[PDB]
Design a protein around this ligand. Sequence first.
Ligand SMILES: *[C@@H]1O[C@H](CO)[C@@H](O)[C@H](O)[C@H]1NC(C)=O
Ligand SMILES: *[C@@H]1O[C@H](CO)[C@@H](O)[C@H](O)[C@H]1NC(C)=O
Ligand SMILES: *[C@@H]1O[C@H](CO)[C@@H](O)[C@H](O)[C@H]1NC(C)=O
Lengths: 50, 464, 120, 114
Amino acid sequence: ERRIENLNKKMEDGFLDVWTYNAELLVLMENERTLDFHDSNVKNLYDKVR
Amino acid sequence: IGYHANNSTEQVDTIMEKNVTVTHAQDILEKKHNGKLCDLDGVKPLILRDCSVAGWLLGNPMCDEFINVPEWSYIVEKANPVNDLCFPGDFNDYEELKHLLSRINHFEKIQIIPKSSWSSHEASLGVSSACPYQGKSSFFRNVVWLIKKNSTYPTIKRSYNNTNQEDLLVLWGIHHPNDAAEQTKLYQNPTTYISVGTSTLNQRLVPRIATRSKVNGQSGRMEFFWTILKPNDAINFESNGNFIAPEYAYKIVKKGDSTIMKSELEYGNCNTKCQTPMGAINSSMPFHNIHPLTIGECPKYVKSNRLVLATGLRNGAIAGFIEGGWQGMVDGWYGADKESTQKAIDGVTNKVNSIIDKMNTQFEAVGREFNNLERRIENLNKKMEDGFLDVWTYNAELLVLMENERTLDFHDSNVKNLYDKVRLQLRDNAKEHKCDNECMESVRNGTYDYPQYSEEARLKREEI
Amino acid sequence: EVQLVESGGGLVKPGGSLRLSCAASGFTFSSYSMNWVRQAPGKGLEWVSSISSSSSYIYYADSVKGRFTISRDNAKNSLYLQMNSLRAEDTAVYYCARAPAAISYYMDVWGKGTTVTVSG
Amino acid sequence: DIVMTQSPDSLAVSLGERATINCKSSQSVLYSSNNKNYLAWYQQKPGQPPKLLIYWASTRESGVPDRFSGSGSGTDFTLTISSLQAEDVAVYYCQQYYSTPALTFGGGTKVEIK
Ligand SMILES: *[C@@H]1O[C@H](CO)[C@@H](O)[C@H](O)[C@H]1NC(C)=O
Ligand SMILES: *[C@@H]1O[C@H](CO)[C@@H](O)[C@H](O)[C@H]1NC(C)=O
Ligand SMILES: *[C@@H]1O[C@H](CO)[C@@H](O)[C@H](O)[C@H]1NC(C)=O
């Protein structure tokens, strides 16, 4: 049953490839937003100051 | 002064807008292929010219001779090979052998039992008109159909060690005659068996005599078998009838990366890093939409017909000081300034490279095959194969749509940044032909002596 | 007319690095693949490395992998073969060989060759 | 790996008679998809580069004398000289190019005047 094992292995590895992509993509976006959160609110304080 | 414009008419797509004209846009998807069955990094494939894996391995006479077969990167079988098992019958665990054959690149044909060694059974008369070799009735070359000599079929006590340090495939089969008369015609013993055994094999095989339909003009069947004989492991055949004996083994020389392509195309004198059943790819861009079951260092499949990056602008942009998207200026994308513009073109190569680095985790489609009684697993495989490509083509489209949205926002933002840099330096709403490199030199070098230009401010306070 | 003059051979120590250079003339260098073939004294021809017209397919012999780095400059009409970590087995006349067909690698025109020697 | 072997290593052929240089192959360099025998034949005098003679195992390179003629198929190949000359005294090498990543030459046959 090497076909099913290779099917299971690529199904298992395929999903973990999908979910590590989602994890890395989600962290990459959240890093982009949270640095944009800090860039924005500092500019908000500068706008509140100005 | 003005952000660059061009009549390129090379549209892109973002999430909020499905069609956005862009001055400079790079496609990242191969729609094109050679349409030729091509080499894979120099190694010639095993092109089964109208022949099957079972036909090649059993040695179908109607197939090509295949004498001293060299290395191969991949095997090419047709979807319906006309030269299947010539004498009709099954091939037991055909697809497992084909999957196992997808993990190798070379065989060495080694001779298990000579035809001459059958001193008590007729090796030569085991022929069939369904398998004609050069017009004369013949049989599979690599496996010997045995027939009784002198109305007697003694039991076949044969054993073969895999004395060879490398692994070995051992092929044989069982005949299934139409009736007891056909059994007696070939094998004097009415009740017969094939009790084969290895370190990891135990099987006895009585022939299933049954009336059957004619296939290739012959209604008797012939079910073939295969076993992986490890080194220093013997396979002991013991039959008193129906024994389609092994004449040749298949010694596995190098186990590597391969696949059995279900491709109908013929050879072209090529060399390509990648190969596809419909052709070959000759570019470094990361996606293609040809057929997912590729081999070699290849773009990773996405089933999208249209996938383009935005490496250019969308065509305040038109508000007040800036004239607009003046097509006359060529050098520089934003303000004809090497500080902001030369770095932007440098990121074009990084952006396409990022998708290569980011979507390198894509699901590599693997060629698995299943027989007519494993339709559930095949549909499970097909929807798993299609499902992951559905997931990853969505991720490719979402990533490109996002990157097209960010990069046009990056171009939209830095135009406002240069306008903000222009606006803060001037410190005046005065718009300000004749004063070239007097009004404009102070802007572009970044040094604006606004106290020196307070005469304009005196004209400002005068004119208001 | 068609010629492949080699240069860069000479004395080398064990483990030393050397770079060969095969000037090309009399033919379109950027259309025919190139090959390197060494011949030790008293031994037969041995193919060393290879490179296609666009430098996109490169091959090396099993004894040569991880030690050599073939390259070419189509504009300069030259071919180069870096050498790194040379053993005493590479005492040979390194011939510069041109394959006319892009895929088929029969070597039509050959160079004089440079006698690289790797010894103390 | 794919390795070629030449049965005669030092052929002794007098002037004006036939010379045959056999070159076997470990694996059949024929390719049925085009029916072309991926083999070359070379000629190397002492102190001269190799000179390609026969390519594709039958097709003769331009400028080669017509007395050269290759033949054979699959594994077994032959280089036939219709009549040896003094200029034919050279080491003859056969070289497959089926396996492009590993091109292997033969050992080499040197024809000597008897
Ligand atoms: C985008 O342009 C393509 C051009 O063929 C067109 O088919 C498609 O309908 C357009 N989409 C929208 C939303 O206008
Ligand atoms: C075959 O014929 C008879 C069959 O019983 C047997 O006794 C005899 O020894 C055999 N002789 C041959 C092979 O001609
Ligand atoms: C031959 O096969 C047997 C198993 O059938 C194994 O024990 C033996 O080691 C093999 N060969 C030899 C001579 O060692």
